[PDB]
């Protein structure tokens, strides 16, 4: 799976979890691309069996597509929580996550997963971390 | 991203051999020499380095400033992933991939994280605990 493919899958998954479906035009708007670019990537996803570009129903995900989408949306959310927890400006989080989510091994993602749990488990740890952020003196 | 990789490698080559040859850059980044030459022309125009008559490529004060920074970012990210327990064999490839898509704000916060764990070994142990759980 290429990085741009992961973005589409992430996007289609979220659209269905919200509107209950995913239209080519909704995808092009969300990723800010021309519908032809979308249609092209869709056929590839259809051939790789992540979804079906069916008639009447439209864009439907296969078990394989729901499995991957679920993991990709989870990956994105975990990375956001991660940056948020260590004190990154909120306005800079989405852009950083969108860029790095694709270049991280599941191994790293799981380790980031334990770190997040590490800080959520004891608030006293967050305070210690934030205190070190004031050691810039 | 790719332009940053170049600046990153060039800096390291000079901090090692004391200079950087086109051939050495092509090999480090596993690319064709014709491809490296094209990038060198751009970096030169942008005033990061300079092709000197008989000295190969030399970095300007700007190139040195940027390069030192990119090597630091790379090393910091490596220690970070190592500290939280990532398989050492998978560290280099992840850092190479993510280093270009991280704001300095993010880098600075990660630097504080590494420092957090470094000042108390008890913390690394608690983190290692959750891993087993
Ligand atoms: Mn993305
Ligand atoms: Mn994402
Ligand atoms: Mn890189
Ligand atoms: Mn690097």
CATH at residue A51: 1.10.10.10
Is-contact A118 A126, C-beta < 8 A? no
Q: For residue B44, how far is its CA from the centre of ligand 2 (angstroms)?
A: 35
Q: Beta-strand (E) ranges in chain B?
A: 49-52, 56-59
* B96 marked as part of a ligand binding site: yes
**B59, B49 Cβ separation under 8 angstroms:** yes
Whole-Å CA distances, A129 to A54, A112, B57, B101: 51, 16, 43, 24
Identify whether residues A47 and A60 lie together within a single domain: yes
**In chain A, what residues touch B95 (CB-CB under 8 Å)?**
none
Length of chain B: 133
In the three-class reduction of DSSP (H, G, I as helix; E, B as strand; rest coil), residue A61 is classed as: strand
Q: Are residues A93 and A125 in the same domain?
A: yes
Picking from A38, A72, A106, the residue at the C-terminal end of a domain is A72
| Documented resolution in Å | 2.4
**Whether residues A108 and A66 fall in one domain:** no
- For this PDB entry, the determination method is X-ray
Which segments within B15-127 are labelled E, that is strand?
Answer: 49-52, 56-59
Q: What are phi and psi for residue B48, nearest 5 degrees?
A: -100, -35
What distance in angstroms lies between residue A10's CA and the mean position of ligand 2's atoms?
A: 6
- Of B70, B103, B124, which residue sits at a domain end? B70
Residues with Cβ < 8 Å from B104, sequence gap 6 or more?
none
Strand, coil or helix: A136? coil
A23 class by beta-carbon count within 10 Å (0-12 exposed, 13-18 middle, 19+ buried): middle
Q: Find where tokens 């000295």 sit.
A: B55
Residues A95 and A109 in one domain: yes
Any idea what the CATH number is for the domain that residue A122 is in? 1.10.60.10
**Is the CB of residue A91 less than 8 Å from the CB of residue A84?**
no
Are A60 and A92 part of one and the same domain?
no
Residues B98 and B64 in one domain: no
For residue A113, give Cα distances in angstroms to A27, A55, A84, A134, B107.
Answer: 29, 40, 13, 26, 19
Q: Do residues B95 and B129 both lie within one domain?
A: yes
Q: Identify whether residues A91 and A117 lie together within a single domain.
A: yes
Question: In a 3-state reduction of DSSP, which class is residue B86?
Answer: coil
Total count of domains within chain A: 2
Helix H or strand E encompassing A53: strand A51-53
> Which of B43, B34, B41 has its CA nearest to residue B4?
B43
Do residues A58 and A80 both lie within one domain?
Answer: no
What span, in angstroms and rounded, lies between the C-alpha atoms of B88 and B25? 25
What are the helix and strand counts (H, E) for chain A? Answer: 7, 2
Same domain for A121 and A90: yes
Residue contact B127–A104, C-beta within 8 A: no
Q: A80, A97 in Cβ contact below 8 A?
A: yes
Range B67-75, long-range pairs (CB < 8 A, 24+ positions): B67/B7, B67/B8, B67/B10, B67/B11, B68/B11, B70/B4, B70/B7, B70/B8, B70/B11, B70/B99, B71/B8, B71/B11, B71/B12, B71/B15, B73/B99, B73/B102, B73/B107, B74/B8, B74/B99
Are B119 and A129 in contact (CB < 8 Å)?
no
Window 70-99 of B, Cβ < 8 Å to A: 81, 84-87, 90, 93-94, 96-98
Angle at B131 between CA A105 and CA A133, to 5 degrees: 80
Tell which of A21, A44, A72 closes a domain.
Answer: A72
A14 and A60 in a single domain? The answer is yes
Q: Which domain holds residue A122?
A: 73-137
Q: Are residues A64 and A97 both part of a single domain?
A: no
Measure the CA–CA gap between A114 and B4, rounded to whole angstroms.
31
């Amino acid at each position: 799976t290429t990085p741009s493919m992961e973005d589409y899958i992430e996007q289609i998954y979220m659209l269905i979890e919200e509107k209950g479906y995913a239209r080519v035009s909704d995808i092009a708007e969300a990723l800010a691309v021309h519908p032809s670019s979308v249609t092209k990537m869709v056929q590839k996803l259809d051939k790789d069996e992540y979804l079906i570009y069916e008639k009447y129903r439209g864009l439907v995900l296969t078990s394989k597509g729901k499995k991957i989408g679920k993991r990709l949306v989870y990956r994105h959310e975990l990375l956001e929580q991660f940056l948020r927890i260590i004190g990154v400006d909120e306005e800079k989080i989405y852009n950083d996550v969108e860029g790095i989510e694709h270049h991280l091994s599941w191994n790293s993602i799981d380790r980031i997963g334990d770190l997040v749990q590490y800080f959520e488990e004891d608030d006293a740890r967050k305070k210690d971390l934030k205190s070190i952020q004031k050691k810039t003196e």
